[PDB]
Write a protein that binds this ligand. Structure first.
Ligand SMILES: [Cu+2]
Ligand SMILES: [Cu+2]
Ligand SMILES: [Cu+2]
Ligand SMILES: [Cu+2]
Ligand SMILES: [Cu+2]
Ligand SMILES: [Cu+2]
Ligand SMILES: [Zn+2]
Ligand SMILES: [Zn+2]
Ligand SMILES: [Zn+2]
Ligand SMILES: [Zn+2]
Ligand SMILES: [Zn+2]
Ligand SMILES: [Zn+2]
Lengths: 335, 335, 335
């Protein structure tokens, strides 16, 4: 009975980081308490100043990743401040009943609610806003993230051997539908509500104007590139709440991948490219063996390079000539 | 030898139901006899009166689901009445040879044919019309359904333990390509043939005008919502003969899912969203644990909510506070 | 250490064939040496004379398939003749480091380079050109193919039993983005560079003008149909470096399929249709049981029949009435 369990309180952190947590644990079930506050805001999503009338959990796209263990109960307080214009709620794909919790968390501006559900299934699961009659708009405008429910004894390979990560990153990929005016330039709207009708018309074409990681073209590049070192295992959590994508690490692999994101199923190994179904989160482990700057991207290369679905991982360490060697550098053809 | 086996005759039923059948059986192989009659007709596919010049097996989209067991022989009589305008045939993905049977079942209006094939592979398999030179048009206009070939000893989990369903529903998802005229309104055609050229032009854009379950926006809602009770296991068969989709049960899961639809392969568990490849049928089991109205939908939320790929399941029973509880209802933020 | 191993030299062959190789081998690791020469050229890609300003490895779309064994080292000399206009490189998804080798193989016209990497993971892997700032254009214009890394002891089923093929075919599927002018006719460009801007505009719509196997509509039909005989097992390697596809054999199955293309993972059996993620290669085995002309195609039937993603396999042998029989040929309906 959940009423008798110890409670713990977790402080969330901004993507692409994930809050401190244990993998395998000796701890018993707990009611794990989180809070998130909705923020509607205009955001610049590309290098030419295009804006999106966005909606977020906790001010970020994606929302922060919440981590618990199988058998825990998630207890979320959702706050919709009076500075917002629209009603919101939350649908946890990790939860059972009431449209994922959406029916129990309808919050108008100035209201808040607290939901509890049992995280009885391991995996990475999408959570997203789903207000009646406005579900697609809230989702594509930025209201999604990941709940990761770890098995109590940690991740396992197909033979039941232990797997682990040394650091975790969370990437949310957002298909955006920004309208254009008669001049062919993207429209800038004074309010969220005014963006609605024109946006729905673009949505219905099924053609995104932009597809971005973590809220903007280039969000995970330059100073904001992800980082690792040779010998470190990274977990890459990838959520796409509305549309399929196909993650790939250039110069690397998915060493162990749960593309449907559910840890009770055996992972696949050695993937070049994996598949995240729209409406899900998946998870890949990779242990770095070579230093350098990798790209992590959606391998529809138009979606990546033209529309924005690509980031970088900068990796320190020693080059390994057994894995790869330039035998002859570029030079004139003989003779 | 099939000539020496006992024959049985099955009466088909209209989707979303599936005809009575056994799962695990003590019965030996049989020649199972079915009949279907093709009906071309204009159908209203949305809430604003848009029509489709449609083509169906047995008067429905999808066609009815045919159920046999591995080792059985399917013997189909296909009838194309003289009231129809076009030639038709049938291609069973469950069958081996002759383009799935299409080469052996070419029936002009006023003709019929009888095909037998051995159902030697377990799974849910698409069947669809495939007349030479007109294959996409016949498929997207409605001529597909599912053949379910059950293992003789019933469904099995990854460890070989028995699985079962207490009721089965069949959902066919149809990407439609309805043309528009200069005024931006959908065109209404007097005959099937007159719809052809304009439809092909829309098809070639790869952008559906509508994506519907079971022939119409809202087909599986209101009085026609699917039904179950807490403690009942439902099988959800999902066919998409032309285009990918990504099924999801809001507030539920795929407890055991064969997304590629082939029962000799281990199922995956705990899925949030699964993937049906265009040209296939898949199958998910779910045991209800909470009462209420669920949505079953394609989790490209634009495809679901804007274009029509969503239905409802109304579930009776007792609410379970351990699985989910509203701890604090929506109320003003403190203080 | 790779420097101490025996070297071997492989002569590549044009798709859809694959160069002679062993499956299970008693041979130890080797440095396997290949050479490929880049050719930019205009190609006719459909039946109405539409041209593509194309770019190829070794003069073909796809490039040839390179076959080695797990533990081998691939040593490629890449040549970019002075008759070409653009810089190129190569990114092997089978390799670890330096953006798949791309950073180490930048070759301007008149240059060549030699890369070595360890093929330490079994599977079919895409290789493709990836020049900085021009990656999508080089890929969609034709610069991709497959590296197949076989396990040293051959392919295995989920229970570890041996699997084999008697012949192998390689199919590359290419989503093309050919621009149109004001008259609605496809544009013909005098040079590769002049095609660039207009092509990028089409790419950004995400709607291919054509989707072809092996460089052209109908490439694998008529005199160029694939061939087999009843009782022969074929391996069908399918690469798609940019966009998802869903292979299907009409009248057949994927008997054993690695849709993510990685041989250390158990294959699935009895597939009707499988899924190749954009940016990957997959592999299916099928043993023919019926003679006749099969179609092998992308089962988005619009993509196949309208846009070009379909080929034929002509199969010799004896018809098997147990698997399929025309019980009653098309004839007038009674009475
Ligand atoms: Cu919202
Ligand atoms: Cu959802
Ligand atoms: Cu037909
Ligand atoms: Cu088919
Ligand atoms: Cu190139
Ligand atoms: Cu790549
Ligand atoms: Zn308590
Ligand atoms: Zn580690
Ligand atoms: Zn008989
Ligand atoms: Zn039951
Ligand atoms: Zn050497
Ligand atoms: Zn053989």
């Amino acid at each position: 009975d959940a009423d008798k369990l110890p409670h713990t309180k977790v402080t969330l952190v901004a993507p692409p980081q994930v809050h401190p947590h244990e993998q395998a644990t000796k701890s018993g079930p707990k009611v794990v308490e989180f809070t998130m506050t909705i923020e509607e805001k205009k955001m610049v999503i590309d290098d030419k100043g295009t804006t999106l009338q966005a909606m977020t959990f906790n001010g970020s796209m994606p929302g922060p990743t919440l981590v618990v263990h199988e058998g825990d109960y998630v207890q979320l307080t959702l706050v919709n401040p009076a500075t917002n214009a629209m009603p919101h709620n939350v649908d946890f794909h990790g939860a059972t009943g009431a449209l994922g919790g959406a029916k129990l968390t309808n919050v108008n501006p100035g209201e808040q609610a607290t939901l509890r559900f049992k995280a009885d299934r391991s995996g990475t699961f999408v959570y997203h806003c789903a207000p009646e009659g406005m579900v697609p708009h809230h989702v594509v405008s930025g209201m999604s993230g990941t709940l990761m429910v770890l098995p109590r004894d940690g991740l396992k390979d197909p033979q039941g051997k232990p797997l682990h990560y040394d650091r975790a990153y969370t990437i949310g990929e957002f298909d955006l539908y920004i309208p254009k005016g008669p001049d062919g330039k993207y429209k800038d709207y004074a309010t969220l509500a005014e963006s609605y009708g024109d946006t729905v018309q673009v949505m219905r074409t099924l053609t995104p104007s932009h597809i971005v990681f973590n809220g903007k073209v280039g969000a995970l590049t330059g100073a904001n590139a992800l980082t690792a070192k040779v010998g470190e295992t990274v977990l890459l959590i990838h959520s796409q709440a509305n549309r399929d994508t196909r993650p790939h690490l250039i110069g690397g692999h998915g060493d162990w991948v749960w593309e449907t994101g559910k840890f009770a199923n055996p992972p696949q190994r050695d993937l070049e490219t994996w598949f995240i179904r729209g409406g899900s989160a998946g998870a890949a482990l990779y242990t770095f063996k070579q230093p350098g700057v990798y790209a992590y991207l959606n391998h529809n290369l138009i979606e990546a390079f033209e529309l924005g679905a690509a980031g970088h991982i900068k990796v320190e360490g020693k080059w390994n000539d057994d894995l790869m060697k330039q035998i002859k550098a570029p030079a004139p053809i003989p003779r």
